[PDB]
């Protein structure tokens, strides 16, 4: 068998990226061998969270009774080389027919969970939107996906960049520093972050004194030299794991000192940086974070676990390292699967102990139910607004404390007069 494939009455696509590789020119039109590249522990954890969710639903005799959920999952380390997997999900015979109707025609899968990053989604989503094939992303935070008319069958189980940027602005307004540097990844995620940041601070006392696109070619000596010359104390770093690590590692090496760092929720629960040698010297690290949401049964599931782009090559893996990895986006994966599973259940007009078998399921039928999702899950209420954004999930403020943990020191109030509160006593500057 394989981790990446599970047969079932209905299939869910799973789009993950559990290896990392920098973009490179290529000379042939062919998939990349992602299994020989850099392993990403926390992404593999979210990969397992989907496998766990499906298995849990298949163990249930009340949700989808006697109707099994299968999946085809992929490790797309390159968004541009992800199309073979995407075609597989959308094909009706290991064939794609470009003019095929949204109604008549039964694709391999009924919907797809993922992908993780905005870049991955932008490359592929239009092909899915065409026949209203539902995508429920567990990670995509680009604000442009809130535009229904551009992304009619795209939903997500995480917050948009606007929410996190509001929280970050909230953190800054709570203290006294008003010059700010903004280091953002040179990609769709980071650039949307920068625009939202500029928009939010424009009519405020906050001055954006320096900003810079972070990419593989970044000369960090000059970045920090420019920051230091402008006497900037607050540095926002809006960037995924690889770029956030490069920034912070470089700062340690270049003797950057006495700063106030602010992380987005993509690296404020990073597990490598808080115990890295010399981390203490760069100053204080604050962040917006996803609260740790406990997923009962997952620990047990993990002990018991350990076509192109369906190979892990991760066999000598420490169960403990995987368990303790950045658990961000966990409930978003879990809810994304459950949302599709409920949508199928209701589309089949399943009852309590059996589902009818006279109903033919089309992806756009799954979409209609998904949009009116309304169900409880680990005591949260899963729903999406008109734009397909989640109406669940909160954000908290964290401070990297002396024992290497991301201590909760505050929370972000989506709807209240003081939008962000912080117990300032907990922060040891």
């Amino acid at each position, epitope marked *: 068998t394989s981790e990446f494939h599970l047969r079932g009455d209905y299939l869910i696509g799973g789009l993950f990226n559990i290896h990392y590789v920098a973009a490179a020119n290529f000379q042939r039109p062919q998939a990349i061998d992602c299994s020989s590249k850099l392993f990403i522990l926390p992404n593999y954890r979210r990969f397992q969270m989907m496998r766990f969710s499906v298995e849990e639903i298949n163990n249930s005799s009340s949700l989808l009774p006697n109707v099994s959920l299968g999946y085809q999952m992929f490790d797309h380390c390159s968004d541009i080389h992800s199309f073979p997997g995407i075609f597989k999900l959308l094909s009706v015979n290991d064939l794609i027919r470009p003019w095929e109707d949204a109604s008549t025609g039964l694709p391999n899968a009924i919907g797809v969970v993922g992908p993780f990053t905005s870049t991955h989604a932008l490359s592929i989503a239009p092909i899915f939107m065409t026949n209203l094939f539902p995508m429920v992303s567990y990670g995509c935070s680009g604000s442009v996906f809130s535009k229904e008319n551009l992304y009619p069958s795209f939903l997500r189980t995480v917050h948009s960049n606007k929410d996190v940027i509001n929280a970050i602005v*909230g953190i800054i*307004l*709570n203290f*006294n*520093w*008003r*010059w700010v540097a903004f280091l953002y990844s040179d990609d769709d995620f980071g650039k949307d972050g920068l625009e939202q940041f500029k928009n939010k601070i424009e*009519d*405020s*006392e*906050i*001055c954006l004194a320096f900003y810079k696109a972070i990419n593989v070619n970044t000369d960090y000596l000059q970045v920090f030299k420019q920051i230091e010359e*402008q*006497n900037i*104390k607050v540095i926002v770093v809006f960037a995924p794991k690889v770029y956030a690590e490069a920034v912070v590692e470089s700062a340690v090496q270049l003797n950057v000192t006495n700063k106030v760092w602010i992380a987005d929720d993509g690296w404020s629960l990073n597990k490598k940086l808080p115990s890295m040698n010399g981390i203490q010297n760069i100053g204080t690290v604050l962040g917006v974070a996803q609260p740790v949401v406990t997923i009962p049964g997952f620990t047990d599931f993990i002990y018991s676990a350990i076509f192109c782009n369906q190979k892990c090559n991760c066999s000598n893996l420490s169960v403990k390292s995987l368990l303790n990895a950045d658990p961000s986006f966990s409930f978003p994966v879990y809810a994304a699967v459950y949302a599709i599973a409920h949508a199928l259940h209701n589309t089949l007009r399943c009852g309590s102990d059996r589902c009818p078998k006279n109903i033919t399921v089309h992806p756009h039928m799954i979409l209609e139910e998904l949009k009116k999702s309304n169900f409880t899950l680990l005591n949260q209420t899963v729903q999406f607004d008109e734009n397909g954004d989640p109406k669940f999930g909160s954000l908290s403020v964290v401070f990297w404390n002396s024992s290497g943990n991301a201590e909760e020191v505050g929370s972000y109030h989506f709807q209240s*007069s*003081i*939008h*962000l*509160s912080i117990n300032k006593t907990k922060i040891k500057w």
Partner: antibody
Amino acid sequence: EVQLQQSGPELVKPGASMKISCKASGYSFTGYSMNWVKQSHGKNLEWIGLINPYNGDTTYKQKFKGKATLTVDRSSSTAYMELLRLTSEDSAVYYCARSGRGAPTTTTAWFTYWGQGTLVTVSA
Amino acid sequence: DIVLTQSPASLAVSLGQRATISCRASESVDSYGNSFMHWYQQKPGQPPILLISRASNLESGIPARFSGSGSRTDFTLTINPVEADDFATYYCQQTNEDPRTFGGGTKLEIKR
């Protein structure tokens, strides 16, 4: 454009208290400190303190601690200063003034917008 | 607390001529590579108006006739040429450290 509109002149008895208002319009209210300034008949200008209307944090000049109390009402975009236990020494014009944009810290901000000022007469 | 002393306490300057006004701080008002001394103009019965921030930066709206210079503890406001409506009291203000303080002001009279 930005307007700060203070409440009108007030006569108040010695010993009483009173609350001056400053209604802000034409900008995002929680984005900037609101400062308060005292000017006695001798015309010396004197910083009373400021409030962060985002969260209500206050910073006072020491002699006005327990004499002045700054608050905001975010729902009406209005800053308030309450003066306590008035003496004839509190007779003065009081201004509100918004911090500008460009200073490195809330401490270093200069005053770009001013209310028209509120004359307070403390007499029996 | 930073004490600001202005001089002269008052001066009279003819239409078309140069007004020089200085401000001395008891301690340096520099930080962040800037000098945090500002100049304000006030007419009787009116709120002060900001002329110059950070020693020498002219606020928009304010005539080029006004300019400032200095750093650390010594600062100067120049009005040139003086016009008839420039009669006012001029105040320096330091914002380098809490509490913000103002000088006692310099009263400019138009000479005729």
